[PDB]
Amino acid sequence: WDIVDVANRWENDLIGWQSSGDYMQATQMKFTSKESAIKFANKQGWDFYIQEPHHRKFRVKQYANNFVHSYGKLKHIRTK
């Protein structure tokens, strides 16, 4: 749940406990599927935003990449 700006958290008079009036701040659900989460979310009648994931771009790596022959300027010094 997105936070409420007045009800999120405030520090106590007394000891400085984090007090809250928002009650869905600790609830968090797990779903197997994205369409599972969407079906449950509009089945319960909730306004939702969905965030698309970001995976890593596949790039081919070789260990022999590290020491290929310099014809011109070296322009780099490896360490290992």
């Binding site: 659900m29 797990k30 779903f31 197997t32 599927s33 599972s36 989460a37 079906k39 449950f40």
Partner: protein, 112 residues
């Protein structure tokens, strides 16, 4: 020694018993699972009263005592709740579980 090694023979016995029960009621038993010394029959909701009756009344089963029945919600499924039933045969000293499903709105039939 592995603690799961002491179960195995009985677990094989349990497998055979369950393969019989599915063969005896093909209209009503969607599946079964044997984990380790624990049998679970997977049965549909409109199929629960013909199965429990069988489990109460067949001389091989005789699951007389109701033990504990409850629900578990998986919110990622279409049918949100699954309803589990635990039975004890004090004659044959054996337990069984019966799992059906239910949505928030649709019922399960009562075995009271």
């Amino acid at each position: 020694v592995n603690p799961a090694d002491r179960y195995l023979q009985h677990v094989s016995d349990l497998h055979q018993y369950a393969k019989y029960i599915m063969a005896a009621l093909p209209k009503y038993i969607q599946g079964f699972s044997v984990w380790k010394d624990e049998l679970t029959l997977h049965v549909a909701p409109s199929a629960v009263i013909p199965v429990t009756t069988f489990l109460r009344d067949n001389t091989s089963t005789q699951y007389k005592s109701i033990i504990d029945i409850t629900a578990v919600d998986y919110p990622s499924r279409e049918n949100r709740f699954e309803v589990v039933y635990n039975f004890l045969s004090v004659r044959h000293n054996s337990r069984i579980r019966l799992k059906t499903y239910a949505t928030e709105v649709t019922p399960v039939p009562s075995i009271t």
